[PDB]
Design a binder for this molecule. Structure first.
Ligand SMILES: Nc1ncnc2c1ncn2[C@@H]1O[C@H](COP(=O)(O)OP(=O)(O)OP(=O)(O)O)[C@@H](O)[C@H]1O
Ligand SMILES: Nc1ncnc2c1ncn2[C@@H]1O[C@H](COP(=O)(O)OP(=O)(O)O)[C@@H](O)[C@H]1O
Ligand SMILES: Nc1ncnc2c1ncn2[C@@H]1O[C@H](COP(=O)(O)OP(=O)(O)O)[C@@H](O)[C@H]1O
Ligand SMILES: [Zn+2]
Lengths: 120, 379, 370, 370
């Protein structure tokens, strides 16, 4: 709606007709806004008078690796899929190409175009 | 068009990922491991030389765009989330890094508070942002941030980490493993920030208002003989392998109280909402009060939201706020993502809107021509 | 009683006291109550829980500042009573309040409850012979020594424009806006956080007021100074640390002349002056433009008169003579006016006696005001 | 099929000709946001109008386009008419001919520029401007009698006898609802409750409409207000905060009957109604006393009719019988008249066409006005 309004406004400025009325001017999606709770759930009375095992609760580092629902308990914390790594290719400002890597960089130490300061 | 990337550079942690996603892909400590330096330098640092800041941000953004995210920087747009009243030179540098070095198409400098509002869907809401450095509040009414009625206090992560370190050094009881079974005080002169943060998260919790109010008067010792509630059991925390630090039960529930302590000035994390809300326009009062939003990782601390909402309703009855904010119904919003990743989620929801993004966002062609990033200060 | 009357300016920022005989106010100290920041249980700390004026300035960093008067209105009366008690202390004046009569200087169009309670305190708590509430604007003209003149009195709490012609004040033409020196200090703190220097504490708010008072110049064209690269002039703090203010210096006090920038719905300091003249009758407009007087502390900004003259000229009619006659003693102009007024034998008739207040009623103070 | 569109300074009453009451009634205001350089959220309209701006008052600066029945900003008025036809009424302006209302003795440029927009911008088939007072008589089924049509913008007194108007007997007074609203703010600020902003002024208008009532004897009412707290009523704001306005309740509408309070130096709404009848011919005066109509929403104050009768009777001769005509629908008295006029087959001829406008120009309106 804002795009159409901004487009209609911009082409009217570009035309420079001073908003001349040649023709007649002028389905809806409505989300319900989230309900506000009167009282949020208090801290459970267990936390008072209970030994805290540091094995059971999770550290920040391993909490934050699962960001979608970072759980306090270890039993909730599920193993995330292994992170894919990158194969870098360099390109200069003035020059175009410089160096690059093959399409089978897995289990290969070969460069498609070998270029380095020690090699010139 | 391609799915625009969202970055949110913070003092403690940086949120990173792609637009139109349920949460951020990578969230990591905002630091860089430079050769020679034993402890890694913090990437965001206010009030330093531009050249030294430029190099740190160049190093950091590189790690985000290749090791954490795997995508070409020049190809797709950027949605840089940064809090309102972020230092001028820092924001100017961050843009100059993205536009000059990386050569990004266009950056959009969204305020964190307005982004947090989009995630809920509500058009108007009060937004408290309890971060690392400063706990900032900013009323947002129907898309317009009200800078007139701003509020900030240094009662975040940094102020809490410092308070924990101080208390641990007073009641210092470590088992080094060298005839140190007996209580040994201050074997190490300072405790590293990484350890203090892990203790805070696991050991320490936020007490109830009734118990907290007693803890405040107890440590004060205001003409009373041992008027403290029964603390939790003492938790033993390993330091650098062999050294086992016994954390006192009092420290766990007293360290947090510095946030909710009045300290004569009447300036807590609780008061900051009511101080701001009283300064707001008379028509906006009832709408903002009903729609409260609590973002920031400091508010993740267990039982913070209950203590805050309770401490609010107690400070309401206090004679200062009793006239204006007397008969008001304070209700908290529960955002879809977790309290840490509310800010990021807004930028992603905004990044998914390709049509509006391109128009609002500052293009590289404009920056190269002008060299003037638009801000809420005069042009 | 014949004994010399005590003039006291009720300035939100700085209250100025002294005798009517003196050409200048001998005792002028900041209008705030100082209590210890940390809630003092123990001995060896700041004792009394009350530090006012010079005592507060000494131990400033330790104490917590709370202004009793906001926007020319008294919020906390218990605090204001302690302040007025410190005016009759060994430190300042050193006299009995029961002996000498009093003159107050309340801002124009204040609440009537503010005037009534102000009188009640000064008649009941202190046993004053006689009291007289007056307008800050009317006094400013007595000091300069002209009958005709518009008085743009920019204080710390409130900025107000009152047009008075040949000793006749048009009460409908008076204009009052809350955007004053204190708001400029608040907005400067925000811009200083945008430069990357936080002043979160109530004590640290006082040094932002000092930074403002020291270094803040009003540019004739604001847009040209923004494009121009700043010198970034260093200011020295009490601890010794240096801060480079830069562009925050000039774009902070601009909010007086353009309060829409931050988002405050007000007219502006250039606008209230012109509107006050335009609201008055057509015959007087020329003489009121020809006689403008700047009063208060929030006119002392470097190049204020230069900017105001330019901003008034474009709004005002073409080929009209605009003279903005600032005195050298703008900050202390309001008091000097009262000191002259008090000295006159006519003042003897104007004030309300203690016995008059007991018999007549509450109205006595309001009806004799004008 | 025809459209009646009252262009009142306070509220714009629009609807279809023949219908009993107007379809869409909204406050005539344009709401522009107090925007900073910070980016704005989604669902953002550049300028809000009417009930939308009335919902989002907090942030938007409310600017009334018509001031004293004179259109100051025509670009703003165009945006209201666009909200009137397209959004509120849900009708094309090209299809239906549009009747507008102008107050009597307005500037000639107002009627000229009004019709120019309707003919060029909206491309209406026919356009007729009418005097608000002339329409208001049709509501009561009375051809003979004077009307005291007091609006938010202006109040005017048009004597019409046996379907013939006396133009020279017409008197206009700039004192109106908005001046009373502005007056009520000042006296509420004197009590304690300060209202400055444009959004706050709208809340003071809601306070005025509900509580304020006209006193029979003002001096007698002030005596009862001082002694007892029976007249003191409480009102809840949009905020939970409640206020007790007290004597200022009946002090606001007094300004109508004695403008000296506002400081205009003019005759009261009672005295101007008398003066207008005396300016007329001696014979017809009888019927004008017998048929004194009160129109607009500034005559919906509880007990204005009783006070009006008393004041007129004192000025007028003793032998004459003075009857004030107060119909239940006074607020919609201007529109309901328009609906009756437009429906009549006789009025079909009096319409000014596009062909008539094109050949002659916008000056044709002055001939075929009344
Ligand atoms: N019941 C009421 N009692 C007192 N004052 C009222 C009442 N209703 C409205 N008012 C005041 O009087 C005004 C009446 O405005 P109204 O709705 O009659 O439109 P208008 O702009 O005056 O149109 P017109 O000039 O054609 O009569 C309002 O703006 C308000 O200030
Ligand atoms: N999941 C969590 N549980 C508890 N505390 C947390 C959590 N995540 C972060 N914190 C704490 O709260 C702080 C949140 O800071 P953050 O909002 O990420 O930084 P910034 O304010 O610079 O954007 C961290 O420094 C950390 O001490
Ligand atoms: N030399 C100065 N330069 C700039 N601002 C000043 C200067 N002196 C005072 N001010 C400002 O003006 C205020 C003083 O207001 P003041 O004139 O005392 O008000 P009042 O007329 O109500 O007594 C200070 O608090 C400060 O904000
Ligand atoms: Zn090269």
């Amino acid at each position: 709606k804002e795009k159409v309004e901004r487009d209609r406004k911009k082409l009217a400025r570009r035309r420079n007709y001073m908003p001349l009325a040649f023709s007649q001017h002028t389905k809806e999606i409505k989300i319900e806004p989230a309900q506000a709770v009167d009282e949020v759930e208090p801290l459970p009375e267990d936390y008072y008078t209970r030994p805290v095992n540091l094995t059971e609760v999770t550290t920040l580092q391993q909490r934050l690796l699962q960001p979608d629902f970072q759980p306090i308990c270890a039993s909730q914390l599920y193993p995330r899929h292994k992170h894919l790594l990158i194969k870098r290719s360099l390109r200069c400002r003035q020059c175009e190409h410089n160096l690059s890597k093959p399409e089978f960089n897995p289990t290969s130490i070969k460069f498609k175009i070998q270029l380095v300061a020690v090699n010139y | 068009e391609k799915t625009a990337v969202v970055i949110d550079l913070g003092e403690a942690f940086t949120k990173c990922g792609f637009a139109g996603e349920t949460g951020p892909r990578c969230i990591i400590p905002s630091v860089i491991k430079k050769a020679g330096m034993p402890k890694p330098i913090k990437v965001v640092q206010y009030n330093i030389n531009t050249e030294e800041l430029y190099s740190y941000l160049k190093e950091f953004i590189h790690i985000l765009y290749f090791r954490h995210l795997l995508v070409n920087p020049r190809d797709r747009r950027v949605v840089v989330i940064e809090s309102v009243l972020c230092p001028s030179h820092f924001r100017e540098t961050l843009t100059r890094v993205l536009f000059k070095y990386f050569e990004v198409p266009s950056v959009l400098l969204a305020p964190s508070h307005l982004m947090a509002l989009l995630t809920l869907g509500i058009n108007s809401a009060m937004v408290l942002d309890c971060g690392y450095r400063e706990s900032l509040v900013l009323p947002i009414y129907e898309g317009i941030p009200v800078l007139n009625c701003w509020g900030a206090l240094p009662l975040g992560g940094k102020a809490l980490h410092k308070e924990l370190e101080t208390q641990l050094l007073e009641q210092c009881t470590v088992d080094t493993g060298a005839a140190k079974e007996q209580s040994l005080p201050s074997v190490m002169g300072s405790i590293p920030e990484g350890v203090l943060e892990d203790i805070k998260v696991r050991t320490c919790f936020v007490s109830d208002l009734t118990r907290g109010l007693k803890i405040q008067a107890a440590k004060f010792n205001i003409d009373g003989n041992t008027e403290r509630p029964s603390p939790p059991p003492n938790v033993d925390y390993p330091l650098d392998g062999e050294k086992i630090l016994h954390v006192l039960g009092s420290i766990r529930d007293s360290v947090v109280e510095i946030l909710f302590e009045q300290d004569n000035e009447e300036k807590s994390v609780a008061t900051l909402i009511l101080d701001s809300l009283m300064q707001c326009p008379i028509d906006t009062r009832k709408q903002l009060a009903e729609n409260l939003v609590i973002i920031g990782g400091t508010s993740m601390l267990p039982g913070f939201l209950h203590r805050l909402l309770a401490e609010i309703r107690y400070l309401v009855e206090k004679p200062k706020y009793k006239k204006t904010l007397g008969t008001k119904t304070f209700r908290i919003h529960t955002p879809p993502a977790k309290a840490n990743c509310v800010a990021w989620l807004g930028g992603a929801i905004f990044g998914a809107l390709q049509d509006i993004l391109g128009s609002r966002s500052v293009s590289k062609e404009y920056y190269n021509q002008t060299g003037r990033i638009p801000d809420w200060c005069s042009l | 009683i014949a004994n010399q009357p005590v003039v006291i300016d009720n300035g939100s920022g700085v209250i100025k006291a002294g005798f009517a005989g003196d050409q200048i106010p001998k005792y002028c100290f900041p209008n705030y109550v100082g209590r210890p920041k940390h809630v003092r249980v123990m001995a060896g700390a700041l004792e009394g829980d009350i530090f006012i004026g010079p005592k507060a300035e000494e131990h400033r960093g330790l104490l917590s500042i709370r202004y009793p008067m906001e926007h020319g209105i008294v919020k906390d009366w218990n605090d204001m009573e302690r302040i007025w008690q410190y005016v009759y202390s060994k430190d300042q004046l050193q006299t009995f309040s029961e002996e000498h009569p009093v003159l107050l200087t309340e801002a124009p169009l204040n609440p009537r409850k503010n005037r009534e309670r102000a009188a009640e305190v000064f008649f009941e708590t202190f046993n004053v012979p006689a009291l007289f509430i007056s307008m800050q604007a009317v006094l400013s003209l007595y000091a300069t020594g002209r009958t005709t003149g518009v008085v743009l009195d920019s204080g710390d709490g409130v900025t107000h424009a009152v047009p008075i012609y040949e000793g006749f004040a048009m009460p409908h033409s008076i204009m009052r806006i809350d955007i004053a020196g204190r708001d400029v200090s608040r907005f400067l703190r925000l811009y200083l956080r945008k430069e990357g220097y936080d002043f979160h504490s109530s004590s640290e708010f006082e040094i932002v007021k000092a930074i403002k008072e020291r270094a803040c110049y009003l540019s004739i064209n604001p847009q040209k100074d923004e494009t121009l690269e700043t010198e970034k002039a260093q200011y020295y703090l009490p601890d010794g640390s240096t801060i480079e203010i830069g562009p925050s210096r000039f774009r902070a006090p601009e909010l007086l002349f353009r309060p829409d920038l931050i988002g405050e719905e007000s007219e502006g300091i250039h606008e209230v002056l012109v509107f006050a003249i335009q609201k008055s009758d057509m015959d007087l407009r020329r003489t009121l433009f020809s006689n403008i007087v700047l009063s208060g502390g929030s006119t002392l900004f470097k190049g204020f008169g230069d900017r105001l003259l330019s901003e008034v000229k474009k709004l005002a009619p073409k080929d009209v003579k605009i003279r903005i006659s600032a005195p050298q003693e703008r900050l202390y102009s309001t008091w000097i006016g009262g000191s002259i007024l008090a000295s006159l034998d006519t003042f003897k008739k104007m004030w309300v006696s203690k016995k008059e207040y007991e018999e007549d009623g509450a109205r006595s103070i309001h009806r004799k005001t004008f | 099929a025809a459209l009646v569109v009252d262009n009142g300074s306070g509220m714009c009453k629009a609807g279809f000709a023949g219908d009993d009451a107007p379809r869409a009634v909204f406050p005539s205001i344009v709401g522009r946001p107090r925007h900073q350089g910070v980016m704005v959220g989604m669902g953002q309209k550049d300028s809000y109008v009417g009930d939308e701006a009335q919902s989002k008052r907090g942030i938007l600066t409310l600017k009334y386009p018509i001031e004293h029945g004179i259109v100051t900003n025509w670009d703003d008025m165009e945006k209201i008419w666009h909200h009137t036809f397209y959004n509120e009424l849900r009708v094309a302006p090209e299809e239906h001919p549009v009747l507008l209302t102008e107050a009597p003795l307005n500037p000639k440029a107002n009627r000229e520029k009004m019709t120019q927009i309707m003919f060029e911008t909206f491309n209406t088939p026919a356009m007729y401007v009418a005097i608000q007072a002339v329409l208001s008589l049709y509501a009561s089924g009375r051809t003979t009698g004077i009307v005291m049509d007091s609006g938010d913008g202006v109040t005017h007194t048009v004597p019409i006898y046996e379907g013939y108007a006396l133009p020279h007997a017409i008197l206009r007074l700039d004192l109106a609802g908005r001046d009373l609203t502005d007056y009520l703010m000042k006296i509420l600020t004197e009590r304690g409750y300060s209202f400055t902003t444009t959004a706050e002024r709208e809340i003071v208008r809601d306070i005025k409409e509900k509580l304020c009532y006209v006193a029979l004897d003002f001096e007698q009412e002030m005596a009862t207000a001082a002694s007892s707290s029976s007249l003191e009523k409480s009102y809840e704001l949009p905020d939970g905060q409640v206020i007790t306005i007290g004597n200022e309740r009946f002090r606001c509408p007094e300004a109508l009957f004695q403008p000296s309070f506002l400081g205009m130096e003019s005759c009261g709404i009672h005295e101007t109604t008398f003066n207008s009848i005396m300016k007329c011919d001696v014979d017809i005066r009888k019927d004008l006393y017998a048929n004194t109509v009160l129109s607009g929403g500034t005559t919906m104050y509880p007990g204005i009719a009783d006070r009006m009768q008393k004041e007129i009777t004192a000025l007028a001769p003793s032998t004459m019988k003075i009857k004030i005509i107060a119909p239940p629908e006074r607020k919609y008295s201007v529109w309901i008249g328009g609906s009756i006029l437009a429906s009549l087959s006789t009025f079909q001829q009096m319409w000014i066409s596009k062909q008539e406008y094109d050949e002659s120009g916008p000056s044709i309106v002055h001939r075929k006005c009344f």
